[PDB]
Amino acid sequence: HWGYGKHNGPEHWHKDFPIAKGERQSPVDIDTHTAKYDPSLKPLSVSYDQATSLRILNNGHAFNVEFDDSQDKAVLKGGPLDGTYRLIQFHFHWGSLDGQGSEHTVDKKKYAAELHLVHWNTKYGDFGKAVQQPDGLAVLGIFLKVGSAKPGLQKVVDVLDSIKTKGKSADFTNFDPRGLLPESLDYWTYPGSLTTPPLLECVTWIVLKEPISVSSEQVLKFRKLNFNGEGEPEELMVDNWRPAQPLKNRQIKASFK
Numbered sequence: 575h576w577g578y579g580k581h582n583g584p585e586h587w588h589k590d591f592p593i594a595k596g597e598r599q600s601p602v603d604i605d606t607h608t609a610k611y612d613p614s615l616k617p618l619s620v621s622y623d624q625a626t627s628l629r630i631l632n633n634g635h636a637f638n639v640e641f642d643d644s645q646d647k648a649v650l651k652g653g654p655l656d657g658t659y660r661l662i663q664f665h666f667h668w669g670s671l672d673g674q675g676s677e678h679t680v681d682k683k684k685y686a687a688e689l690h691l692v693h694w695n696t697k698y699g700d701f702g703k704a705v706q707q708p709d710g711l712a713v714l715g716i717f718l719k720v721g722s723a724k725p726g727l728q729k730v731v732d733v734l735d736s737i738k739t740k741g742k743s744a745d746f747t748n749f750d751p752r753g754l755l756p757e758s759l760d761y762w763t764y765p766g767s768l769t770t771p772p773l774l775e776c777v778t779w780i781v782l783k784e785p786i787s788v789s790s791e792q793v794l795k796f797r798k799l800n801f802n803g804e805g806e807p808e809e810l811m812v813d814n815w816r817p818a819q820p821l822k823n824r825q826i827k828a829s830f831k
């Protein structure tokens with residue numbers, strides 16, 4: 575029953591998910607002046623060449639592009655990570671207007687949207703077990719700004735008409751998530767949480783410094799989705815982001831000087 579409305583949004587979540595007020599909640603503001611370069615960070619390895627996308631689903635909160643994670647087909651390694659993390663899905667958070675939509679902020683700047691590529695630590699065997707561990711997940715976050723179109727996003731944009739409402743899904747095979755990345759893999763990293771209920775504190779966040787550009791037309795199509803199910807009163811799927819949470823006892827590290 576949680577959502578992003580006045581009556582079920584981020585201010586209400588703690589009543590059913592008390593970890594909402596926990597010690598390593600996400601997202602956070604990334605103060606670039608306070609973040610410190612970490613020479614101990616290993617190079618980041620995004621290995622998506624054998625990725626097998628399967629399906630796209632409107633879950634009433636966002637839309638997920640789901641992958642076959644039964645083998646090491648698309649994995650994230652290196653950086654702050656120990657071991658291998660397998661891609662299970664990606665999704666976005668976005669705003670009603672171009673000036674808001676991201677979950678993380680950079681020196682308080684909000685981007686139009688934010689892409690989350692979600693991975694689980696293979697040493698735990700399955701996603702469900704991984705979310706019971708402090709190092710169970712790694713989410714690669716990428717900011718979206720409005721400018722030129724992102725060609726690798728267009729296939730996603732064009733399928734959205736078929737998953738307008740909650741519970742709808744469509745085939746989404748043969749999609750290459752490499753087309754959603756910027757040129758640079760420079761990043762910030764910190765320990766955090768899922769940004770939606772259940773808000774579990776299992777995530778190593780890796781947030782890329784370089785945003786991708788998407789066109790106004792592309793993001794406008796995100797905003798035509800519905801939070802509601804078919805037949806129900808239309809509630810546009812917009813502003814599905816949690817604001818920045820207290821940093822508490824955490825340091826954000828940078829991979830770059």
Ligand SMILES: NS(=O)(=O)c1ccc(CCO)cc1
Pocket residue numbers: 690692713767768769770771772
């Ligand atoms: N927004 S997020 O990437 O922290 C996130 C990833 C995965 C889940 C589990 C429910 O699909 C919840 C939130």
Ligand SMILES: [Zn+2]
Pocket residue numbers: 665666667690769
């Ligand atoms: Zn997310």
